[PDB]
Design a protein around this ligand. Structure first.
Ligand SMILES: *[C@@H]1O[C@H](CO)[C@@H](O[C@@H]2O[C@H](CO)[C@@H](O[C@@H]3O[C@H](CO)[C@@H](O)[C@H](O)[C@@H]3O)[C@H](O)[C@H]2NC(C)=O)[C@H](O)[C@H]1NC(C)=O
Ligand SMILES: *[C@@H]1O[C@H](CO)[C@@H](O[C@@H]2O[C@H](CO)[C@@H](O)[C@H](O)[C@H]2NC(C)=O)[C@H](O)[C@H]1NC(C)=O
Ligand SMILES: *[C@@H]1O[C@H](CO)[C@@H](O[C@@H]2O[C@H](CO)[C@@H](O)[C@H](O)[C@H]2NC(C)=O)[C@H](O)[C@H]1NC(C)=O
Ligand SMILES: *[C@@H]1O[C@H](CO)[C@@H](O)[C@H](O)[C@H]1NC(C)=O
Ligand SMILES: *[C@@H]1O[C@H](CO)[C@@H](O)[C@H](O)[C@H]1NC(C)=O
Ligand SMILES: *[C@@H]1O[C@H](CO)[C@@H](O)[C@H](O)[C@H]1NC(C)=O
Ligand SMILES: *[C@@H]1O[C@H](CO)[C@@H](O)[C@H](O)[C@H]1NC(C)=O
Length: 168
């Protein structure tokens, strides 16, 4: 029962950014026989750590790993974007009580100011130099649709809206 982990945790990334997919293993692993299935199609890497460099739209997809005698892991979907601001979430679905981190991500990792996060059309939090609205203990009422607004350079921008569900 393997489980694909990511680093950054962000599973919604811009174009050209890099992400690393590690197969069920927190720190140190042994085997050299690891399988990767990008969109189902077997991959060319064997190492347990499948890196992804300059993010091309084609990288967006469904992945998974399996060992010699283990049933393939629950696929994970990676989406790549091109836009001024992208709203990133730790996980999109959560178990009541778990942690939750949302991030109003600027393009080219620039700097965003006058930030405001919104949940279900309501103003929620606000800062100058931006922040990362974080949640330790997650309530089910936290489930909703978020999006953020901010000033890049000297213009305002709105982010694509994102759904989030906290089940019990
Ligand atoms: C795995 O399957 C997914 C299908 O969801 C593939 O992702 C899709 O890839 C295409 C081509 O990169 C994306 O569309 C492109 O968008 C640009 C910009 O809007 C446009 O100018 C191009 O003409 C093209 O339409 C498409 O949106 C994307 N799907 C999603 C949801 O992001 C992915 O490429 C597949 N992986 C492999 C290795 O085939
Ligand atoms: C993705 O990885 C690349 C490679 O490490 C990063 O760009 C590197 O930038 C350094 C400058 O310190 C150069 O020495 C390398 O040659 C560059 N690598 C490549 C492949 O061009 C890049 O910054 C990473 N992406 C992000 C978002 O940080
Ligand atoms: C987020 O979830 C909401 C539902 O909570 C989706 O909105 C519904 O969309 C369907 C069809 O698009 C409509 O029939 C419903 O009336 C909508 N509900 C509301 C309250 O507007 C929404 O499409 C989802 N968005 C994403 C990005 O997944
Ligand atoms: C290759 O695998 C080892 C562990 O077997 C790991 O420490 C290392 O980071 C991996 N290298 C790459 C490029 O994935
Ligand atoms: C492993 O996969 C087989 C089918 O190939 C399935 O019967 C079995 O239940 C799986 N292992 C576990 C722990 O579920
Ligand atoms: C908060 O978000 C920023 C983005 O500006 C990121 O670089 C940083 O690592 C995050 N801080 C923490 C403590 O996770
Ligand atoms: C999380 O918060 C709930 C109340 O909202 C509380 O009952 C529970 O003990 C908290 N969990 C932890 C680990 O403190």
């Amino acid at each position: 029962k393997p489980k694909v982990s990511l680093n950054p945790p962000w599973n919604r990334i811009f174009k050209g950014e890099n992400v690393t997919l590690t197969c069920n293993g927190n720190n140190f692993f042994e085997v050299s026989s690891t399988k990767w299935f990008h969109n189902g199609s077997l991959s060319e890497e064997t190492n347990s750590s499948l890196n992804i460099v300059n993010a091309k739209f084609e990288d967006s997809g469904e992945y998974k790993c399996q060992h010699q005698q283990v049933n393939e892991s629950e696929p994970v979907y990676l989406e790549v974007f091109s836009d001024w601001l992208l709203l990133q979430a730790s996980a999109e679905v959560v178990m009541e009580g778990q942690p939750l981190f949302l991030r109003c991500h600027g393009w080219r990792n620039w700097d965003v100011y006058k930030v405001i996060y919104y949940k279900d059309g309501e103003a929620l939090k606000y800062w100058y130099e931006n922040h990362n609205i974080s949640i330790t203990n997650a309530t089910v009422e936290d489930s909703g649709t978020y999006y953020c607004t901010g000033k890049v350079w000297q213009l305002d921008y709105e982010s694509e809206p994102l759904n989030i569900t906290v089940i019990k």
